[PDB]
């Protein structure tokens, strides 16, 4: 049935890939500080691409992991600026979903003329309660087949909550 396996939000990840180093990346980190209320972590390149203008071991992106009530309020603000419609793709086959916003002034803080415009990627993952069995150290395991939330379960939950709608497929 459904005693306690209903669903829950595990974490929300805010990702900004500025593609260069310096003032732009630092200002993106300040945007993440002011939005999440939490120190952002700067992600680093993997290999050089000539067309991308990136170099190996050069700081490229920045991301924040948030959990709990702050995760749900950030998700609510993101869905509010995304007018509660999400394109079905937008719900990956392992149930985790996400979207992307441009011109982050649409939610929250004013422009702060010294930082700039930074679009960001919202990515959210969900789990049924009991993912500690595959995350903990001693006596690891894998969740069973009446678990590991699917696309249909996620879209059913996302149509039950939030009063949202989906697209064609």
């Amino acid at each position: 049935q459904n005693p306690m396996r209903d669903l829950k939000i595990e974490k929300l990840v805010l990702n900004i890939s500025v593609g260069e180093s310096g003032d732009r990346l630092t200002r993106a980190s300040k945007v993440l500080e002011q939005l999440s209320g939490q120190t952002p972590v700067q992600s680093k390149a993997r290999y050089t691409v000539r067309t991308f203008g990136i170099r190996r071991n050069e700081k490229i992106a920045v991301h924040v992991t948030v959990r709990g009530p702050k995760a749900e309020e950030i998700l609510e603000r993101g869905l509010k600026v995304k007018e509660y419609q999400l394109r079905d793709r937008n719900f990956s086959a392992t149930g985790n979903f996400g979207f992307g916003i441009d011109e982050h002034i649409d939610l929250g803080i004013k422009y702060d003329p010294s930082i700039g415009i930074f679009g960001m990627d919202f990515y959210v993952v969900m789990n049924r309660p009991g993912a500690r069995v595959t995350r903990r150290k001693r006596c690891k395991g894998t969740v069973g087949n009446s678990h590991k939330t699917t696309k249909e379960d996620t879209v059913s939950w996302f149509k039950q909550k939030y009063d949202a709608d989906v697209l064609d497929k």
């Binding site: 150290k137 001693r138 006596c139 690891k140 395991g141």
Partner: protein, 294 residues
Amino acid sequence: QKDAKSSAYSSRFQTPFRRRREGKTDYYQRKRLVTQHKAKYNTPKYRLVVRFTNKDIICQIISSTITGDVVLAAAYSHELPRYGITHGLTNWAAAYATGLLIARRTLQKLGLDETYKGVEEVEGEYELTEAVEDGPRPFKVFLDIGLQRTTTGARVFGALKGASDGGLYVPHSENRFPGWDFETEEIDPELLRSYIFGGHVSQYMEELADDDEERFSELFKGYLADDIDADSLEDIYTSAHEAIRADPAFKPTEKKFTKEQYAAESKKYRQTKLSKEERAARVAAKIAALAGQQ
């Protein structure tokens, strides 16, 4: 999900050891703990194995044999309420009491109890059990934590200090007990005495009873049921310490509904395997059920 692994993969697959596969032991650590200096030839290396479940603390003295590890002494936090501690069976004071209990139990069993009295004036100071001159050396065991983190302020180190105060020569340093401020690089005797005598639970009780009645009530229902006041934790923990110093001998339970009754009736719901003719009968029944091109 079309990720079924191939027969070649399953044939070349080397399974790990049983305990590594069930994720209970670290064999690197086990090797280094139980390999003996070969010039002693028979002396077992004795492990103070400390484990923590969600509701119990298991503290054992284990030696290693080719046929399998054997137990010299055992002490359980669900046996602690016989002494003095009816609540908080997995706290720091329970860990210290279990270490004291296992140390006194193994010394009573080995007949090393008249000497090596330990402390009896528990003060939260760091000392090693010095060997008594012209007498037997102290019993040497090595702490087996297992897989848990060796962070500062760990109940396994609470049990370590319990054994060290009980009289077992555990080799250890003081940079893992609570109150070890690395800025000052010494120990805090007052804070460590508070942690031994359960001071953090006491300050927690007075803070909750001052601020939130519903959270204090919800977490401490059994405390209010026994009417145990917020300032009697040190009284009951001390009285438990001298009860441990009095009688560290294992009293088994009443053992009602004996072993053969347990085997005969308490476990009969295990579903029995079939044999060859029954398996062939199920195969033929499925052939009859799936007969036809439907």
